[PDB]
């Protein structure tokens with residue numbers, strides 16, 4: 001039936017991806033009522049992240065006891081309080097932990113990750129080399145190929161592609177960089193339903209989406225202290241937001257174990273994405289994420305100017 005097939009296609013765009021009440025297990029998440037300053041939701045894995053800074057905490061139970069001010073660094077709490085704008089993430093890096101938090105209505109949402117030892121000035125020197133290569137490009141075809149190659153080198157993903165939307169949100173792959181033999185994806189077309197409108201809109205909130213392992217077990221948000229409002233909390237601005245299992249299976253069918261995509265914007269208009277696949281699971285720290293986003297933004301700026 002024709003209208004039935006259309007119902008099914010329309011269901012794609014209606015899965016509530018913004019409120020899964022779970023996360024990917026490469027970080028831990030705390031949800032805290034702003035006025036109560038009380039921990040109301042915590043990921044089922046919070047223990048193994050806050051046990052790195054605080055040794056009193058070894059179980060999810062201990063988080064009901066825990067105070068925010070022992071768990072979170074002070075600059076994080078001060079920035080989150082002194083922040084008026086909703087959904088704009090603050091980042092605070094201790095000696096052991098990398099925090100990203102933001103305010104959404106009466107909720108503070110805090111994501112915490114681990115990180116590797118860093119090399120000073122590496123972020124900036126890498127961006128400098130990308131800035132110079134993208135700026136020396138004089139046609140869009142050199143620009144986009146250069147972009148895929150740089151994203152490939154910075155991230156180390158097995159495959160980096162530029163996926164360009166047409167006026168109806170259908171898209172095609174227009175450039176490719178690979179770390180191994182692959183059958184070409186060049187000029188392969190995909191329908192608009194493969195990235196439903198809700199996912200397309202998510203790049204306007206967080207321009208990078210990151211999936212380190214398609215088979216990693218999502219961790220649900222447990223209730224800690226009974227929140228005033230039991231509505232689902234919107235997790236859109238972070239990176240830990242659990243992945244729609246449909247898209248996980250889509251990645252498996254692709255032969256992919258890790259994914260990362262970055263929106264390509266012209267002003268507020270989503271023009272396309274950088275799509276990144278890995279055959280084995282892969283994680284990339286916050287600094288590689290920010291470098292990728294910043295590289296894509298400079299490439300976009302160049303893309304709208306050159307012929």
Ligand SMILES: *C/C=C1/C(=C/c2[nH]c(/C=C3[NH+]=C(/C=C4\NC(=O)C(C=C)=C4C)C(C)=C\3CCC(=O)O)c(CCC(=O)O)c2C)NC(=O)[C@H]1C
Pocket residue numbers: 011012013015017161163173185190193194195196199209211242243244246247250259260261273275276
């Ligand atoms: C009925 C629903 C469907 C559906 C849902 C869905 N898809 C995403 C997210 C993404 N889909 C992407 C598609 C592509 N990746 C590629 O490499 C290519 C072509 C080479 C395409 C077309 C991409 C890139 C994303 C972003 C995530 C990522 O980078 O992997 C979501 C959002 C999931 C989430 O963000 O939690 C949803 C709900 N896909 C379908 O095919 C139908 C069945």
